[PDB]
Enzyme design. Sequence first.
Site, PDB file in Angstrom:
ATOM      1  N   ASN A   1       0.817  -1.204   0.000  1.00 53.07           N
ATOM      2  CA  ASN A   1       0.000   0.000   0.000  1.00 53.07           C
ATOM      3  C   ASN A   1       0.855   1.260   0.000  1.00 53.07           C
ATOM      4  O   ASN A   1       2.011   1.254   0.435  1.00 53.07           O
ATOM      5  CB  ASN A   1      -0.920   0.043   1.226  1.00 53.07           C
ATOM      6  CG  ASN A   1      -0.252   0.689   2.434  1.00 53.07           C
ATOM      7  OD1 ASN A   1      -0.301   2.016   2.493  1.00 53.07           O
ATOM      8  ND2 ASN A   1       0.314   0.008   3.291  1.00 53.07           N
TER       9      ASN A   1
ATOM     10  N   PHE B   1      -1.546   8.478   4.267  1.00 50.19           N
ATOM     11  CA  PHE B   1      -2.295   9.098   5.359  1.00 50.19           C
ATOM     12  C   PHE B   1      -3.637   9.702   4.944  1.00 50.19           C
ATOM     13  O   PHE B   1      -3.927  10.860   5.261  1.00 50.19           O
ATOM     14  CB  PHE B   1      -1.464  10.189   6.048  1.00 50.19           C
ATOM     15  CG  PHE B   1      -0.306   9.669   6.858  1.00 50.19           C
ATOM     16  CD1 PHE B   1      -0.270   8.344   7.291  1.00 50.19           C
ATOM     17  CD2 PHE B   1       0.734  10.523   7.227  1.00 50.19           C
ATOM     18  CE1 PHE B   1       0.786   7.880   8.082  1.00 50.19           C
ATOM     19  CE2 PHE B   1       1.791  10.072   8.018  1.00 50.19           C
ATOM     20  CZ  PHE B   1       1.818   8.744   8.447  1.00 50.19           C
TER      21      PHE B   1
ATOM     22  N   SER C   1       6.061   5.575   8.364  1.00 50.82           N
ATOM     23  CA  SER C   1       5.338   5.343   7.119  1.00 50.82           C
ATOM     24  C   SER C   1       6.240   5.617   5.931  1.00 50.82           C
ATOM     25  O   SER C   1       6.978   6.599   5.916  1.00 50.82           O
ATOM     26  CB  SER C   1       4.126   6.260   7.009  1.00 50.82           C
ATOM     27  OG  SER C   1       3.593   6.201   5.692  1.00 50.82           O
TER      28      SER C   1
ATOM     29  N   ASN D   1       5.042   6.080   2.909  1.00 56.15           N
ATOM     30  CA  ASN D   1       4.232   6.752   1.901  1.00 56.15           C
ATOM     31  C   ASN D   1       4.105   8.273   1.994  1.00 56.15           C
ATOM     32  O   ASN D   1       3.311   8.882   1.271  1.00 56.15           O
ATOM     33  CB  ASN D   1       2.852   6.094   1.858  1.00 56.15           C
ATOM     34  CG  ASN D   1       2.947   4.579   1.693  1.00 56.15           C
ATOM     35  OD1 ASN D   1       3.689   4.086   0.846  1.00 56.15           O
ATOM     36  ND2 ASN D   1       2.204   3.840   2.505  1.00 56.15           N
ATOM     37  N   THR D   2       4.888   8.883   2.876  1.00 52.41           N
ATOM     38  CA  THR D   2       4.904  10.334   3.018  1.00 52.41           C
ATOM     39  C   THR D   2       6.367  10.746   2.880  1.00 52.41           C
ATOM     40  O   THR D   2       7.202  10.403   3.714  1.00 52.41           O
ATOM     41  CB  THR D   2       4.352  10.780   4.384  1.00 52.41           C
ATOM     42  OG1 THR D   2       2.973  10.403   4.484  1.00 52.41           O
ATOM     43  CG2 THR D   2       4.456  12.292   4.531  1.00 52.41           C
TER      44      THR D   2
ATOM     45  N   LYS E   1       6.447   4.409  16.735  1.00 54.23           N
ATOM     46  CA  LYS E   1       6.396   3.337  15.748  1.00 54.23           C
ATOM     47  C   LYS E   1       7.512   3.446  14.714  1.00 54.23           C
ATOM     48  O   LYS E   1       7.526   4.361  13.887  1.00 54.23           O
ATOM     49  CB  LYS E   1       5.031   3.333  15.050  1.00 54.23           C
ATOM     50  CG  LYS E   1       4.786   2.099  14.186  1.00 54.23           C
ATOM     51  CD  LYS E   1       3.320   1.994  13.782  1.00 54.23           C
ATOM     52  CE  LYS E   1       3.048   0.750  12.936  1.00 54.23           C
ATOM     53  NZ  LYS E   1       1.613   0.666  12.565  1.00 54.23           N
TER      54      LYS E   1
ATOM     55  N   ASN F   1       6.595  -1.278  11.235  1.00 57.70           N
ATOM     56  CA  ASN F   1       5.713  -0.756  10.179  1.00 57.70           C
ATOM     57  C   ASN F   1       5.965  -1.594   8.915  1.00 57.70           C
ATOM     58  O   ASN F   1       6.654  -2.606   8.968  1.00 57.70           O
ATOM     59  CB  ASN F   1       6.032   0.718   9.885  1.00 57.70           C
ATOM     60  CG  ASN F   1       4.825   1.494   9.343  1.00 57.70           C
ATOM     61  OD1 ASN F   1       4.187   1.088   8.367  1.00 57.70           O
ATOM     62  ND2 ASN F   1       4.516   2.629   9.979  1.00 57.70           N
TER      63      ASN F   1
HETATM   64  C1  LIG Z   1      -3.716  -0.735   3.923  1.00 57.12           C
HETATM   65  C2  LIG Z   1      -2.806  -0.366   5.155  1.00 57.12           C
HETATM   66  C3  LIG Z   1      -2.907   0.866   5.844  1.00 57.12           C
HETATM   67  C4  LIG Z   1      -2.034   1.187   6.913  1.00 57.12           C
HETATM   68  N1  LIG Z   1      -2.002   2.375   7.385  1.00 57.12           N
HETATM   69  C5  LIG Z   1      -1.135   2.630   8.536  1.00 57.12           C
HETATM   70  C6  LIG Z   1      -1.366   3.921   9.199  1.00 57.12           C
HETATM   71  O1  LIG Z   1      -2.152   4.789   8.786  1.00 57.12           O
HETATM   72  N2  LIG Z   1      -0.572   4.176  10.345  1.00 57.12           N
HETATM   73  C7  LIG Z   1       0.357   3.218  10.846  1.00 57.12           C
HETATM   74  O2  LIG Z   1       1.058   3.374  11.805  1.00 57.12           O
HETATM   75  N3  LIG Z   1       0.458   1.993  10.161  1.00 57.12           N
HETATM   76  C8  LIG Z   1      -0.239   1.618   9.048  1.00 57.12           C
HETATM   77  N4  LIG Z   1      -0.085   0.373   8.400  1.00 57.12           N
HETATM   78  C9  LIG Z   1       0.835  -0.532   8.850  1.00 57.12           C
HETATM   79  C10 LIG Z   1       0.256  -1.524   9.951  1.00 57.12           C
HETATM   80  O3  LIG Z   1      -0.323  -0.830  11.090  1.00 57.12           O
HETATM   81  C11 LIG Z   1       1.327  -2.544  10.350  1.00 57.12           C
HETATM   82  O4  LIG Z   1       2.272  -1.793  11.082  1.00 57.12           O
HETATM   83  C12 LIG Z   1       1.983  -3.417   9.139  1.00 57.12           C
HETATM   84  O5  LIG Z   1       1.018  -3.579   8.072  1.00 57.12           O
HETATM   85  C13 LIG Z   1       2.478  -4.676   9.716  1.00 57.12           C
HETATM   86  O6  LIG Z   1       1.462  -5.585  10.254  1.00 57.12           O
HETATM   87  P1  LIG Z   1       0.645  -6.660   9.355  1.00 57.12           P
HETATM   88  O7  LIG Z   1       1.712  -7.504   8.635  1.00 57.12           O
HETATM   89  O8  LIG Z   1       0.069  -7.564  10.415  1.00 57.12           O
HETATM   90  O9  LIG Z   1      -0.222  -5.957   8.438  1.00 57.12           O
HETATM   91  C14 LIG Z   1      -1.022   0.156   7.297  1.00 57.12           C
HETATM   92  C15 LIG Z   1      -0.936  -1.045   6.598  1.00 57.12           C
HETATM   93  C16 LIG Z   1      -1.808  -1.334   5.548  1.00 57.12           C
HETATM   94  C17 LIG Z   1      -1.616  -2.703   4.856  1.00 57.12           C
HETATM   95  O1  LIG Z   2      -1.331   5.522   5.089  1.00 58.71           O
HETATM   96  C1  LIG Z   2      -0.261   5.109   4.565  1.00 58.71           C
HETATM   97  O2  LIG Z   2       0.154   5.315   3.404  1.00 58.71           O
HETATM   98  C2  LIG Z   2       0.654   4.252   5.422  1.00 58.71           C
HETATM   99  C3  LIG Z   2       1.117   4.675   6.634  1.00 58.71           C
HETATM  100  C4  LIG Z   2       1.994   3.803   7.409  1.00 58.71           C
HETATM  101  O3  LIG Z   2       2.444   4.108   8.501  1.00 58.71           O
HETATM  102  N1  LIG Z   2       2.302   2.568   6.811  1.00 58.71           N
HETATM  103  C5  LIG Z   2       1.852   2.099   5.571  1.00 58.71           C
HETATM  104  O4  LIG Z   2       2.172   0.997   5.115  1.00 58.71           O
HETATM  105  N2  LIG Z   2       1.012   2.995   4.891  1.00 58.71           N
END
Ligand SMILES: Cc1cc2nc3c(=O)[nH]c(=O)nc-3n(C[C@H](O)[C@H](O)[C@H](O)COP(=O)(O)O)c2cc1C
Ligand SMILES: O=C(O)c1cc(=O)[nH]c(=O)[nH]1
Length: 336
Positions: A111, A115, A175, A177-178, A217, A246
């Site tokens: 992804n 944000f 993140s 993506n920023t 994080k 992350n």
């Molecule tokens: C679609 C999507 C949106 C996410 N958005 C954020 C976010 O806004 N803020 C954040 O700290 N992590 C975000 N993450 C990361 C997750 O919180 C997590 O740290 C990462 O995906 C690892 O765990 P998982 O393998 O169990 O998904 C996002 C991940 C995905 C896949």
């Molecule tokens: O919102 C996102 O683009 C985003 C934030 C983050 O912390 N991690 C991630 O995979 N996506």
Amino acid sequence: MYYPFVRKALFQLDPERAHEFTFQQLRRITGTPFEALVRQKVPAKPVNCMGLTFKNPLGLAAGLDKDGECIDALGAMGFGSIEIGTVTPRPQPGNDKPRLFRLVDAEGLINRMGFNNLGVDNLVENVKKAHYDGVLGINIGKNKDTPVEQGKDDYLICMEKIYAYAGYIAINISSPNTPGLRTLQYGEALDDLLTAIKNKQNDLQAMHHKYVPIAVKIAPDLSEEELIQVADSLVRHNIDGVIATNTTLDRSLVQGMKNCDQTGGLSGRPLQLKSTEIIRRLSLELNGRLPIIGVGGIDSVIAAREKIAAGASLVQIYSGFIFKGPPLIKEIVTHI
Ligand SMILES: Cc1cc2nc3c(=O)[nH]c(=O)nc-3n(C[C@H](O)[C@H](O)[C@H](O)COP(=O)(O)O)c2cc1C
Ligand SMILES: O=C(O)c1cc(=O)[nH]c(=O)[nH]1
Ligand SMILES: O=C(O)c1cc(=O)[nH]c(=O)[nH]1
């Protein structure tokens, strides 16, 4: 119904369209009696961490409920804690679509959301209306247009507004993506950020007469040396906890697979090992001075237990929740 059929249907739609549909239904029932349709019994397994008491070690990682719209429905599913956000001071749309991709054979996701959220004021109002009894974590970050070198103010601005409604606050500086957001975890830039955050926490504690813990994080793409410096900085500034990890920019385990070259952060199964090993090295350096919330590819009871053994006090899930649904929650909490 049987989640596999649910997933089967959902996987026919575009990834984000699937999420929007799911949340459309959740928001439709959250806080109402319909909530019983997703609710499930889960044994209690209390854990004291960061001065708080989590009903169980499993939490919903940030990113699913970015605006905190379905706290009650998700809570009914069994989560010991829920992390909403990432939220920024002002609402922003995020990157262009498509921005979310599935790697079904790898049980992972990529992804580059950027944000996408409705802003901290909106989130605060949602939280006020929630009835969740678990620990609520509020994850915050920098608006896209805010010069990364002045990003600290966006964190402080959000902190001031959410302090009175958060179980703990999560600082997102990982993140991918920023633009430039990850630079905040290195050197003096990290030290200055933590200094400001701890000072803000100190003022807010005097203002609200209570201590709200703060967790940072970090990314999984840090080298051994870097990981050690970050950990040490967290200790020097008395940060309350660290959330690892992350999403990753690495693609070495997903070569030759559809969407393997899409730009963004990779999550799910392909992140499991990397994440656990980082937790282990992190835990070694921290040497018990502050707790670790482990996250990254957890998709089974054993994967969760591995994170705990590596040194984590709590764990969160996201991707695995999408591939295995509600049953995963019950499994982990019941047997972890
Ligand atoms: C679609 C999507 C949106 C996410 N958005 C954020 C976010 O806004 N803020 C954040 O700290 N992590 C975000 N993450 C990361 C997750 O919180 C997590 O740290 C990462 O995906 C690892 O765990 P998982 O393998 O169990 O998904 C996002 C991940 C995905 C896949
Ligand atoms: O919102 C996102 O683009 C985003 C934030 C983050 O912390 N991690 C991630 O995979 N996506
Ligand atoms: O259909 C069900 O019973 C059901 C669906 C779901 O997603 N979660 C749950 O706990 N039950």
